Amino acid sequence: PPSLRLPVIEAAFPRQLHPYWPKLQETTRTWLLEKRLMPADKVEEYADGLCYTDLMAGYYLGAPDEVLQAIADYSAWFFVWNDRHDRDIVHGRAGAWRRLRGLLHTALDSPGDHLHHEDTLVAGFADSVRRLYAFLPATWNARFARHFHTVIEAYDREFHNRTRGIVPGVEEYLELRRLTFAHWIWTDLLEPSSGCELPDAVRKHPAYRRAALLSQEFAAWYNDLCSLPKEIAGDEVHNLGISLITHHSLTLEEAIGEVRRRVEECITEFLAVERDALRFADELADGTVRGKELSGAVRANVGNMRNWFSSVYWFHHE
């Protein structure tokens, strides 16, 4: 599909695949069934039909197998939560949504108290979170939590928008989508994948931070690009293209053009800033053992920021 083809990705971002990929799919399918997160037909479709675990296998290269599996299971949980959210919206279950919203905040802080919750979606959350908390120091766990609390609240904003038929302005949508897509969660997960919690001064370096953000922007905006045409009109669904059509009087074709332009700007800016981020990685190798460790971690994470582009792109195409 010409609107969806990106010659730069095909030329410049060779696909990578974590060797654990076959076991990843089997184990995630088993986990989804064990936690009763979705019925069998839906679980088989997710793991075996669309093979969603490949998205993670093409992203977090170098992760230990246990970390990758924890990420894939969390990402599978996230898919199920999004489905629940959409269903709550379509059927107006404000009460069930508010309850879930509050339960997820509570379980994020104390997963242990929620492993056997009556709501299997909450129990599955608690199990994934508990597992993700076992890899790095509590400082990383608290950052993941702070970021995820923010994601939950953004889902609540989208709930009220969509149920009341409010289409967010373009700039309002960009900001919200950074939260509902969970940009900063996938960014956080780079660190257990490379075995190192990065100090604030390192991950807040402007080359690292901008590289990290652009990687997520591409994923989110390319997703919106792929799905815009077949989106259901028109006020009760969030998509950059729809905000443009609604608030900028664009036609569908024009909006597709604007979303694609933004996507390409993301790729070309990433190519420029990635080089700065890799230079920073080298600069961290100041001769010491610790410097070598940090340098390798940043280099690995920046490599994965790049891998996300091709993982996302080829997943949509295949």
Curated annotation (Swiss-Prot):
Catalytic activity annotation: (2E,6E)-farnesyl diphosphate = (+)-epi-isozizaene + diphosphate
How many cofactors are bound and how?
Binds 3 Mg(2+) ions per subunit. Can also use Mn(2+) and Fe(3+) but less efficiently, and other divalent cations such as Zn(2+), Fe(2+), Co(2+), Cu(2+) and Ni(2+) are nearly completely inefficient as cofactors.
Please list the GO terms describing molecular function.
Answer: epi-isozizaene synthase activity; metal ion binding; terpene synthase activity
The coenzyme or cofactor needed here is: Mg(2+); Mn(2+); Fe(3+)
Q: What is its EC number?
A: 4.2.3.37
For Mg(2+) 1, which residues are the binding ones?
A: 82, 86
Q: Is Transmembrane given among the entry's keywords?
A: no
**Coiled coil regions in record:** none
Q: Where does Mg(2+) 2 bind?
A: 82, 86
In which residues is Mg(2+) 3 bound? 223, 227, 231
Which keywords does the record carry?
A: Lyase, Magnesium, Metal-binding
Pathway-wise, it operates in: Sesquiterpene biosynthesis; epi-isozizaene biosynthesis
Q: Where is the signal peptide?
A: none
Motif DDXXD motif: where in chain: 82-86
Q: What is known of its domains?
A: The Asp-Asp-Xaa-Xaa-Asp/Glu (DDXXD/E) motif is important for the catalytic activity, presumably through binding to Mg(2+).
Summarize the protein's role. Catalyzes the cyclization of farnesyl diphosphate (FPP) to the sesquiterpene epi-isozizaene.
Which protein family is named in the record?
Belongs to the terpene synthase family.
Which PANTHER family does the entry mention?
BETA-PINACENE SYNTHASE-RELATED, TERPENE SYNTHASE
Per its record, how is this protein called by name?
Epi-isozizaene synthase
What gene codes for this chain? cyc1
